[PDB]
């Protein structure tokens, strides 16, 4: 009959995904990785 | 950890190194301390020891290559050596109360100098 009905719902779905991160990316941990000389096997030193 | 061994490392023949060993506290070096290695076949000579008071005596026969030194602020400890030989192949370890045994001590890490 003669009228206004509201059949359903409208939505904006959202354009394509955004994250943001701060500027630190990376603190160099090669401190331990890539040393000139390397130590022995079992001197195991504990660099923290 | 109450004793860490710093630095160290390999040695090439006709070379010199320094040792350190950063102690926990002035307390614990009563009476006696220890840089001690283990000589191929030699036996177990005493070579760095100190007291809490701030004495130092060391063995006249093989005191022509060691020297010692001591800083309060960080506890650090210095062994200054020069010409190192053969004479030294093993790896140290800087132990208090070593002179009572291998029982009532606290081991910590320790280090290497050996040459060819
Ligand atoms: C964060 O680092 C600087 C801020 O000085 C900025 O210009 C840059 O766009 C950001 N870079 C990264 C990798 O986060
Ligand atoms: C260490 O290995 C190589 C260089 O030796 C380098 O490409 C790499 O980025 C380094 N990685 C770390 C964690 O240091």
């Known amino acids: 009959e003669k009228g206004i009905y509201q059949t359903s719902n409208f939505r904006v779905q959202p354009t394509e995904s955004i994250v943001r991160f701060p500027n630190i990316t990376n603190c160099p941990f090669g401190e331990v990785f890539n040393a000139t000389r390397f130590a022995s096997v079992y001197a195991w030193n504990r660099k923290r | 950890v109450q004793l860490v061994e710093s630095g160290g490392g390999l040695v090439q023949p006709g070379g010199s190194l320094r040792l350190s060993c950063a102690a926990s506290?002035?307390?614990?070096?009563?009476?006696?301390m220890s840089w001690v290695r283990q000589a191929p076949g030699k036996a177990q000579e005493w070579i760095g020891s100190?007291?809490?008071?701030?004495?130092?005596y060391i063995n006249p026969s093989l005191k022509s290559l060691v020297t010692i030194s001591r800083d309060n602020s960080k506890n650090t400890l210095y062994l200054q050596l020069n010409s190192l030989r053969a004479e030294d192949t093993a790896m140290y370890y800087c132990?208090?109360?070593?002179?009572?045994?291998?029982?009532?001590?606290?081991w910590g890490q320790g280090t290497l100098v050996t040459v060819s």
């Open positions: 100190m007291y809490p008071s701030g004495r130092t």
């Open positions: 506290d002035s307390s614990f070096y009563d009476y006696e």
């Open positions: 132990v208090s109360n070593w002179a009572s045994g291998s029982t009532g001590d606290y």
